[PDB]
């Protein structure tokens, strides 16, 4: 992985720096690294593809070194370098694609393609140089077992789930108390509804709780907490829990009461935020507990009092809400997020070449299924393919 990244990095630096007219002093070290790459790869045969519709491709390396003396680079130098770089970039892209489409339940972090397994030999370690990218840096740190940290803008940590819980219900679905939520991506909208508006609730307060267990521990997380959940604040015909029938929801939004957002690690309260909205920081957590209360207004204007009668029918249903958006976070594991394209790249490569479903990932690399059952083998394979995809993105 480090040798493949070094190949890609050398090729990227050659493309960016070996340009007509530039001083040779701008590239001398780069030229030496490029020549080391050529020497190390010379006389080696590689094969890629042979899986799905990915074509079999053979690669033989017989290239000369760059040894010309110049003060400034000219067109001849750049054309020679360009020919060599084009061949090497094609080889690296094919190796990356071959590795991205493969997986194993055992040793999923280890190389899977024969080309990358061959690149893991000692004789190729000479190619290795600067490893500065976040993904390769995390790879090296993990191989050393230090903390690795991936920073995510809007991490895709919550599998999609639009669900509800009815704590009080009956077949007519006209006197319901419960919660409905959408946990999607970095976002959580939750709403506790009571059709009676806590008319008979002790102290005229109805308590709602929502526990969301993250599949991985998040750290240094910036969270936006807003009082209302816009997704559960309009009239809605919802299906029955078993699908037999449909019930009606006619929200009237009351501000949530006694809001407590707890960020827990191993069941222990790491962060607690009471009646606090806007930007908050969760420094280290694996679970979120949103506890909020529907409090019946002690004093109502006639228009308000008309909405909440003493008994059924309950035409307007009192709803309190909460919206929790993870703007940014850090995770030791790899995740999809709004800013990066690694999941997109892997999925595109697997779809384009019609890669059959393997024993590790779900069909089509569906992120919801993958994150729902984010097993250690899945995590290893995902980190491998994401690192390969980041390596490929440097060139392609």
Partner 1 sequence: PAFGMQRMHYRNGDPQTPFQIAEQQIQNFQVANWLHFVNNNQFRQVVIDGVLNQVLNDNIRNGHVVNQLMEALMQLSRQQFPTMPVDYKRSIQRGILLLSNRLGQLVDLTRLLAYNYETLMACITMNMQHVQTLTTEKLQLTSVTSLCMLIGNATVIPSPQTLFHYYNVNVNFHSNYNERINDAVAIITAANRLNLYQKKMKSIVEDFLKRLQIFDISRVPDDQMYRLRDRLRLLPVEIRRLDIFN
Residues placed in the known binding site for Zn(2+):
153
Token readout for 218 is 């998040």
> How many whole angstroms separate alpha carbon 194 and alpha carbon 251?
9
Is residue 28 a contact residue for partner 1 (CB under 8 A)?
Answer: yes
State which residue, 184 or 265, has the beta carbon closest to Zn ion.
184
Segment 61 to 90, residues that bind its own copies, using CB under 8 A: 72, 74-76, 78-80, 83, 87
User: Which residues inside 294-333 make contact with its own copies, applying CB under 8 A?
Assistant: 297, 299-304, 307, 316, 318, 327-330, 332
Our finding on whether 77 is near partner 1 (CB under 8 A) is yes
CB of 291 to its own copies, least distance (A): 19
Query: Could you say which of 68, 146, 239, 240 contacts Zn ion (CB under 5 A)?
Result: 240
> Which tokens sit at 58?
């053979």
- Using only C-alpha atoms, the chain has a radius of gyration, in whole angstroms, of 28
Positive/negative CA dihedral, 284, 289, 290, 295: negative
Q: Which of residues 136-155 bind its own copies (CB under 8 A)?
A: 137, 140, 142-147, 149, 151, 153-154
241 binds, among its own copies, partner 1, Zn ion, none (CB under 5 to 8 A by kind): Zn ion
Which is nearest to 208 in space by CA: 165, 265, 269? 165
Show contacts with its own copies in window 4-63 (CB under 8 A): 13, 15-17, 19-23, 25-26, 28-29, 32-33, 36
Pick one of 24, 87, 160, 277: the residue that binds partner 1 (CB under 8 A): 24
Distance of CA 394 to the CA centre of its chain: 19
Distance (Å) of CA 114 to CA 95, 119, 157, 182:
9, 9, 33, 43
Tell which one of 230, 241, 275, 312 touches its own copies (CB under 8 A). Answer: 230
What is the x/- site pattern for Zn ion, positions 186-225, by CB under 5 A?
----------------------------------------
Binding mask 98-137 for partner 1 (x = CB under 8 A): -------------------------x--x-----------
- Give the HSE-up count for residue 211: Cα atoms under 13 Å, Cβ half-sphere: 6
CB 329 within 8 A of CB 222: yes
Query: Which H or E run includes 282?
Result: strand 278-295
- Are residues 386 and 338 in contact, defined by beta-carbon separation less than 8 angstroms? no
213 CB-near residues (< 8 Å, 6+ apart): 286, 287
Q: Which residue has the tokens 């002093």?
A: 25
CB of 366 to Zn ion, least distance (A): 23
Q: Does 377 bind its own copies (CB under 8 A)?
A: yes
Query: Residues 241-270: x/- map of binding to its own copies (CB under 8 A)?
Result: ---xxxxx--xxxxx---------xxxx--
- What span, in angstroms and rounded, lies between the C-alpha atoms of 144 and 47? 30
The site for partner 1 (CB under 8 A) is made up of 24-25, 28, 31-32, 35, 39, 62-72, 74-77, 80, 84, 123, 126
């Amino acid at each position: 992985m480090d040798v493949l990244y070094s190949l890609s990095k050398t090729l990227k630096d050659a493309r960016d720096k070996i340009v007509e007219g530039t001083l040779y002093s701008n590239v001398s070290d780069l030229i030496q690294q490029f020549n080391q790459m050529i020497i190390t790869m010379n006389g080696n045969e590689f094969q890629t593809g042979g899986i799905g519709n990915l074509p079999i491709r053979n690669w033989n390396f017989d290239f000369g070194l760059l040894g010309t003396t110049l003060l400034n680079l000219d067109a001849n130098y750049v054309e020679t370098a360009r020919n060599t770089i084009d061949y090497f970039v094609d080889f690296v892209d094919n190796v990356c694609m071959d590795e991205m489409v493969r997986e194993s339940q055992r040793n999923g972090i280890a190389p899977q393609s024969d080309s990358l397994r061959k690149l893991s030999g000692i004789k190729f370690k000479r190619i290795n140089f600067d490893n500065s990218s976040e993904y390769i840096e995390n790879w090296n740190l993990q191989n050393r077992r230090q903390r690795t940290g991936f920073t995510f803008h809007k991490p895709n940590i919550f599998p999609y789930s639009a669900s509800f819980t009815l704590n009080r219900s009956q077949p007519a679905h006209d006197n319901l108390m419960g919660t409905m939520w959408l946990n999607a991506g970095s976002e959580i909208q939750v709403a506790g509804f009571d059709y009676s508006c806590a008319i008979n609730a002790p102290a005229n307060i109805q308590q709602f709780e929502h526990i969301v267990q993250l599949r991985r521990v998040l750290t240094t997380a910036t969270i936006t907490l807003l009082p209302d959940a816009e997704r559960f604040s309009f009239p809605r015909v919802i299906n029955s829990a078993d699908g037999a029938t449909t019930w009606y929801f006619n929200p009237v939004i009351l501000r949530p009461n006694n809001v407590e957002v707890e960020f827990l690690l191993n069941g222990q309260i790491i962060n607690t935020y009471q009646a606090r909205f806007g930007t908050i920081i969760a420094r280290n957590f694996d679970t979120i507990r949103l506890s909020f209360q529907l409090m019946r207004p002690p004093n109502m204007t006639p228009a308000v009092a008309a909405l909440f009668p003493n008994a059924q029918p309950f035409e307007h249903h009192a709803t309190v809400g909460l919206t929790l958006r993870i703007e940014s976070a850090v995770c030791e594991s790899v995740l999809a997020d709004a800013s990066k394209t690694m999941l997109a790249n892997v999925t595109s490569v697997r779809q384009e070449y019609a890669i059959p479903v393997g024993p590790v990932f779900p069909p089509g690399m569906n992120w919801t299924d993958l994150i729902t059952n984010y097993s250690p083998s899945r995590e290893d394979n995902l980190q491998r393919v994401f690192t390969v995809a980041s390596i490929r993105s440097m060139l392609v």
